[PDB]
Amino acid sequence: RQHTMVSFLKPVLKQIIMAGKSMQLLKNLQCAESTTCQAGARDAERKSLY
Amino acid sequence: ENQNVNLTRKGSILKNQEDTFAAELHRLKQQPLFSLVDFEQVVDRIRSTVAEHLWKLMVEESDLLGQLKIIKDFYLLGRGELFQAFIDTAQHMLKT
Amino acid sequence: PQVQSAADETAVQLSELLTLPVLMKRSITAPLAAHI
């Protein structure tokens, strides 16, 4: 149902989808252990989206 | 540990750094959140150190290359002229 | 050290890093091995 679009995210829903797709690709592409998994800012130390 | 049971008291590959990794694990225990990333990083560092020391022991101390060369010469018939001469000499015994 | 002070914290640092059997082994056999 077209109604499944989140209205508050709808203006940014496309960018959100693109970011999610890129991250899903990177984690889903068998990347060599890319140094860009920096041991620095943990996603737990990253302020959560909330 | 199994090799050090038979090998003379050669210390750990990491030797005194084992306690350092223990201290890192204690810090991880002190971490309020379990991070798989930091644990995996420490485990990978220890693994890499152990693997490099093991490779050095195997190749220089344990001469893995010599054993592979022997296996090639005999099991893989690497000494093809030698195994050919052996076949030529033993054919009467091994044809039966 | 083990359990012989109060404020001291290193006295148990090995006891938290190492298990009691392994700690006891390390603590006893090294001088034991030296004397043997």
Swiss-Prot record, chain A:
Tissue expression = Widely expressed, with highest levels in heart and skeletal muscle and moderate levels in brain.
Superkingdom of source: Eukaryota
The subcellular location is: Cytoplasm, Cytoskeleton, Microtubule organizing center, Centrosome
Q: What does this protein do?
A: Component of the gamma-tubulin ring complex (gTuRC) which mediates microtubule nucleation. The gTuRC regulates the minus-end nucleation of alpha-beta tubulin heterodimers that grow into microtubule protafilaments, a critical step in centrosome duplication and spindle formation.
User: Assembly and interactions?
Assistant: Component of the gamma-tubulin ring complex (gTuRC) consisting of TUBGCP2, TUBGCP3, TUBGCP4, TUBGCP5 and TUBGCP6 and gamma-tubulin TUBG1 or TUBG2. TUBGCP2, TUBGCP3, TUBGCP4, TUBGCP5 and TUBGCP6 assemble in a 5:5:2:1:1 stoichiometry; each is associated with a gamma-tubulin, thereby arranging 14 gamma-tubulins in a helical manner. Gamma-tubulin at the first position is blocked by TUBGCP3 at the last position, allowing 13 protafilaments to grow into a microtubule.
The record's family statement is: Belongs to the TUBGCP family.
Q: What is this protein called in UniProt?
A: Gamma-tubulin complex component 5
* Organism name: Homo sapiens (Human)
Q: Which residues of the full protein are shown?
A: 544 to 593 of 1024
Swiss-Prot record, chain B:
Protein name in UniProt:
Gamma-tubulin complex component 4
**Tissue specificity remark:** Ubiquitously expressed.
- What subunit structure does UniProt give? Component of the gamma-tubulin ring complex (gTuRC) consisting of TUBGCP2, TUBGCP3, TUBGCP4, TUBGCP5 and TUBGCP6 and gamma-tubulin TUBG1 or TUBG2. TUBGCP2, TUBGCP3, TUBGCP4, TUBGCP5 and TUBGCP6 assemble in a 5:5:2:1:1 stoichiometry; each is associated with a gamma-tubulin, thereby arranging 14 gamma-tubulins in a helical manner. Gamma-tubulin at the first position is blocked by TUBGCP3 at the last position, allowing 13 protafilaments to grow into a microtubule.
Q: Where is the signal peptide?
A: none
Which disorder is it connected to?
A: Microcephaly and chorioretinopathy, autosomal recessive, 3: A disorder characterized by congenital microcephaly and chorioretinal dysplasia associated with poor vision and nystagmus. Variable ocular anomalies include microphthalmia, retinal folding, retinal detachment, optic nerve hypoplasia, absence of retinal vessels, round areas of chorioretinal atrophy, and attenuated electroretinogram. Most patients have mild developmental delay and mild learning difficulties.
Instruction: Identify its protein family.
Output: Belongs to the TUBGCP family.
Name its cellular compartments. Answer: Cytoplasm, Cytoskeleton, Microtubule organizing center, Centrosome
Biological role: Component of the gamma-tubulin ring complex (gTuRC) which mediates microtubule nucleation. The gTuRC regulates the minus-end nucleation of alpha-beta tubulin heterodimers that grow into microtubule protafilaments, a critical step in centrosome duplication and spindle formation.
Tell me the part of the parent protein that is shown.
287 to 382 of 667
Name the source organism: Homo sapiens (Human)
Domain of life of the organism encoding this protein? Eukaryota
